[PDB]
Each structure stands twice: as structure tokens, then as C-alpha cells.
Amino acid sequence: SIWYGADRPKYLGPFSGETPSYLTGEFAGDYGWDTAGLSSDPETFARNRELEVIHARWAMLGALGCLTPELLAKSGVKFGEAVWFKAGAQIFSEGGLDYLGNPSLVHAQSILAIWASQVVLMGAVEGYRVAGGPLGEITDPIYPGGSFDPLGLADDPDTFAELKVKEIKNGRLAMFSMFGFFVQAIVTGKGPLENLNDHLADPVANNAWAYATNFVPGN
Amino acid sequence: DSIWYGADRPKYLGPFSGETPSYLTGEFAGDYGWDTAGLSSDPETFARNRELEVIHARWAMLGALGCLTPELLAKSGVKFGEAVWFKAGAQIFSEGGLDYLGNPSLVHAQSILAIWASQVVLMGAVEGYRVAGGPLGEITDPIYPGGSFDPLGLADDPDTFAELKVKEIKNGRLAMFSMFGFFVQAIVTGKGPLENLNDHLADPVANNAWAYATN
Amino acid sequence: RSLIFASKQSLSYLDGTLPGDYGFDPLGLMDPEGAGGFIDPQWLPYAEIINGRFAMLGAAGAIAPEVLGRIGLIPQETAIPWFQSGVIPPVGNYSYWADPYTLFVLEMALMGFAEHRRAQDYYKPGSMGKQYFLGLEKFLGGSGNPAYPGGPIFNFLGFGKNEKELQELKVKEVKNGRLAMMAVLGYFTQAIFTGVGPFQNLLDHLADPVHNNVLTNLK
């Protein structure tokens, strides 16, 4: 289609002339952007693709889950810390982790139990992803299908490829946005949507340039 | 034949040279066989690293010259309000604004947004022209356009061309190392490079780097 | 033959056949099939004229009250900037011949009688020269051009003998409306970043050009 093939939209648009030979257009999200030469080998390129897709999916989940508590708090739902980068310290509070301020819900108190459960379950699922498990065997490391395609949206090749491209694009957007979350948390010290509100209030004054003069190395 | 090329070229470890990578055959400028991480084994990645090195070297040369000249002029007497290289972006936020050479009849910029937008547009255009075609000629080599950017014809004779390539990569690697030094000194010492040099010249025994190792 | 900054396609669909044709389509919304074939190809030129036509009235109407009150032909009580004239009550509401909610209904009624007829000339040319409307339906028949009806009422003064005169007067009017659209957009945005009317902004700029420009205002 438009995305797959020699004539595909490139990351530099009309300014792209040096298209890497190994980047031909047979994989999703192939804009021909490889200037560091870090995916020249076919095996290294496959490993990089796998890393990219896993990172993309995790970034999508993280972006949605970092701002969902923010939106719920803005509506009026009570939390312990709505902000994502202090949402993890409420396990140490006397009331535990309420999960939407509901003591009848998870109501966890021991971070050790959370850590152990996460280690066991994530190890299991990670290992299944690498080698196969209950939800089918491993054929494509990043496009298993079957038990992870219950709605069967990836039935014909054309829709499956277009959905590949759409997935990778939303995922790259999410990864960019999560890098933004991290940097903004580091510098501003306030939640993402709170920074959005500050920017909307006084865009000229409340912006990133306001914090340019905070890391001056006086010594 | 150029003494800087071939298999008889000097090594990065000098007399202590041992094993040299096969792909490093000296056919490119600035080759000393320094690849211990195997980060340029493949020819394509080697070429990409070459363009990255040349661009980084040129940018570092510009950066070092622009970090030295303003504060040297300040030493001469041309006051700027904030002369040190890392204390140079805050001039815009001041009431007077960013004044070139400390004079109001120069650029006299006061809004960071305008500088950012104009620079974004212009740098995008020029960087696109760097890889694709553009007014100043088309693409012949990724990092050596040719006579379009060589108006004095220093590349006319191939031997002097290769010698100039070697000299360029030399001066540029020196500039990159100096720029890393600038960054580390600013982070650690917190003072300008010329003032650091003056402090070292004053009492080098005590006013050296080991003094600031106390954390 | 005169052209302006044009993309690759541009000339493919745009050509020197309609008034004011210059080929500028960065995004190419006028693509015949392309992306944008849902809108009728005759719609975009027609809408472009009309939005510009109203822009002439708006750009010549938002600034007349202030200037005419400064040179002096109108009492200063009613000489107010356009955003204090009742369009934005919370920024300003000046009492008028009637309350603004009745003026709106009188507006919508009169505009409707003048706008529905225009609509169905475009859809069905010459359809308004059939039914009796106070006897003035013979004039309102149109020349077949939705954008340029023509007639003893809408062309009462009658400029333009041959097609040579019209083919350039149309170019003039689309271009005089070109500035009018930008002028109103200036009115809007130049008003949001300020609190006071357009005319004095020109006077402030004419007073201290190096102190009241866009860069100095806010940031």
C-alpha cells in the first residue's frame, strides 16, 4: 500500500534523499530513519523491531494510565496522589492503596507482597512471550495472534498491515509523550495535565522556557 | 602517497599497537585503528559513523570557537552582561534583552519565542538541504558537497584534498574533546573556561581539578 | 500564467481557469478525487468568495465606528470597539434598539430569507426566477454562475461591458477580499492578545513602533 513499498512517506518528507538500503519498506512504520546505522544487520534489525514494538505497547499503556487518574481527579474522583510520579508512594500511607479511594477495593499495604506478586506474574508472562504458554504457542515474537486476536481484526492481510502501521504510529506517539512525561516531571515537579492547564492559562509565561534558568551550574 | 593512509599509518596507541580491525584499512581520513567496541564493523554503520563524526566535529569546532571568542572579547573589555558561554541564554530574559556585542543598535532581541521559531524554520530548511538538494547545489557526497561549499578550491588537487581531510578531522576531534571538557568543567567547577585557565596558571599545584574532588 | 508557491500536484487540479487562480495548496484539499472528493468541486470556490465577501463587510465594519468617532462624526457614547458591541456580553454589552436576543431573531429571519434563496440557486440554478416573490423574481434569476448572479438588482450600477473588464474585476474583488479575510483574522487575534480596539493599536504602533509591536506585546 502507500506505507509499504519504495514510495513511502519518509520522516524528512520532501527532504529525504539518503534512504538506507536495508530499509526498503517491507515493515510497518518504515520512514527510512536510520542515521546511526544501528539496524544494518538483519538480525539486529529484527531485534530492534521487537524492542520498538514492545516499548511502544508499554508506552501506550503508560501514557493512558498516567493521565487517567488525572482526568478522574479533575472530575472529582478522590485518590491518594492522582499525579503519576507520586502515585506509587501511597503504599507507605497508613490507609494503603485505595484504588479510586475505595477501601473495599484492592486496599494493599505491603509493598513487599506487591513486588513478589509482580515478579512472579510478570516473569511468567514474559517467559510465555519468549517461549510460549497457555495463550497459544510462539510463531511471531511480536504478532502472535490467536488468543491475543480474539476479535479477529487481523484476518485479511491488508487490514492487518494497515493496523500494523496504525499501531506503530500511535505507539511512537505514546513513547514520545512518555519521554515528555518523564522530563516534565523531572523539571517542573507537577503532573502532566497540571502543566497542560498552566500552559493553557498563560502560554507565553507558563512554558518550558520559564524553567530554562533552573539548572544553571553556579558550582 | 599520503603517510596518513595505508597500512603503515600511525596508530592510536603508537608503538603499543596490537590487533587492528580488518575493516579499518586506512582508506578514510583520520583512521588510527581505534575501534575496541566493534561499533563500526559493518561498512554501512561505519559510513554512518563517519558522517556522524564529521558533523559532530564541525559543530564542536564552531561551538569551541563561539565559547572562546565572546569571553576573550570580554577580557579585552567588551562587556556583555553575561559573557560566560553557559551563562549566555539568560541574556534574553533580562530587561535589556539579548544585545549583540553589548550594543543596543545591534540585533537587540527580547522574545525567546521568536528566536526559537525562526531558528527552527531556518535550521530545518538547511538540514533538509544538507541531505537532499537545495539552492547551494545538489547532493554529491553526504558530508563533502564539493565546489559549491568549497569556493577557494582546496579540493582541486587530490593529495592536498586528503591532507586537508586529515587536518580537518584532527582539529575537529580536538575541538570535540575540548567541548566535552567545557561541559564537564561547567558542570563541576561552574566557571568559565578562560577563568579556569587563569586559575590554573595562578597556582596550578593547588588550583587544579583534584581540588574539586571532595564530594 | 502568474503562479505562487505551489506543491507538486497543485497544477494538476488547479489551473488558470477561474478568477484568482494561483495554485497555492500546501495540503491540497481541492483534490478532485484525492482526499477531499466528498465536497463538490464547485463548493470550495463558492465558499471562498462568500467568506471573503463577508470579510469585506466585517473588516470595513469593525473599524469604522472607532475611526469615525475619533475624527468625529458620531457621539462617543456609541463609538465603541467591535468587541464591546454586544457580540461578547461578558466583555461588553451596549443596549441597542432592542435586546440582543430579539435582534438575533430578526437577524436569523432576514438572513434566512436572503440565505435559503442563495442556497438553492447554487443547488438548482435559475430556480428563483419561477415563483412569485412580491414581483421581484424576474431580476433574481441569475446568470448561471452561483458566485456571480448578475442582474438589475445585484448589478444595478452595471460595471463591465465585455468579458475583458469582468475577468480582471473578479480578480480584483477576490484579492481585495483576500486581504479582508486576513484583516478580520487580524482583528480577532489582535484583539484576543490585547484588551482594547484595533484602531488605537495602529495608533500605538505609529506612536512607539519599537515598543508596541507583536514581539513586545506579551512575548
Ligand SMILES: CC1=C[C@H](O)CC(C)(C)[C@H]1/C=C/C(C)=C/C=C/C(C)=C/C=C/C=C(C)/C=C/C=C(C)/C=C/C1=C(C)C[C@H](O)CC1(C)C
Ligand atoms: C529511530 C532512531 C534512529 C537512529 O538510528 C538513532 C536514533 C535517532 C537514536 C533512534 C531514535 C530513537 C528514539 C527517538 C527512541 C525513543 C525512545 C522512547 C521515547 C522510549 C519510551 C519508552 C516509554 C515507555 C517504555 C513507557 C513506559 C511506561 C510505564 C512503564 C508506565 C508506568 C507507570 C505509570 C503508568 C504511572 C504509574 O503511576 C506508575 C508507573 C509504574 C510509573
Ligand SMILES: CC1=C[C@H](O)CC(C)(C)[C@H]1/C=C/C(C)=C/C=C/C(C)=C/C=C/C=C(C)/C=C/C=C(C)/C=C/C1=C(C)C[C@H](O)CC1(C)C
Ligand atoms: C572512538 C570510540 C571508539 C570505541 O569503539 C568506542 C568509544 C571509546 C566509546 C568511542 C569514543 C567516542 C568518543 C570519545 C566520543 C566523543 C564525543 C564528543 C566529545 C563529542 C562532542 C561533541 C560536541 C559538540 C557537538 C559541541 C557542540 C557545541 C554547541 C552546540 C555549542 C553551543 C553554544 C555555544 C557555542 C555556547 C553559547 O554560549 C550557547 C550555545 C548555543 C550552547
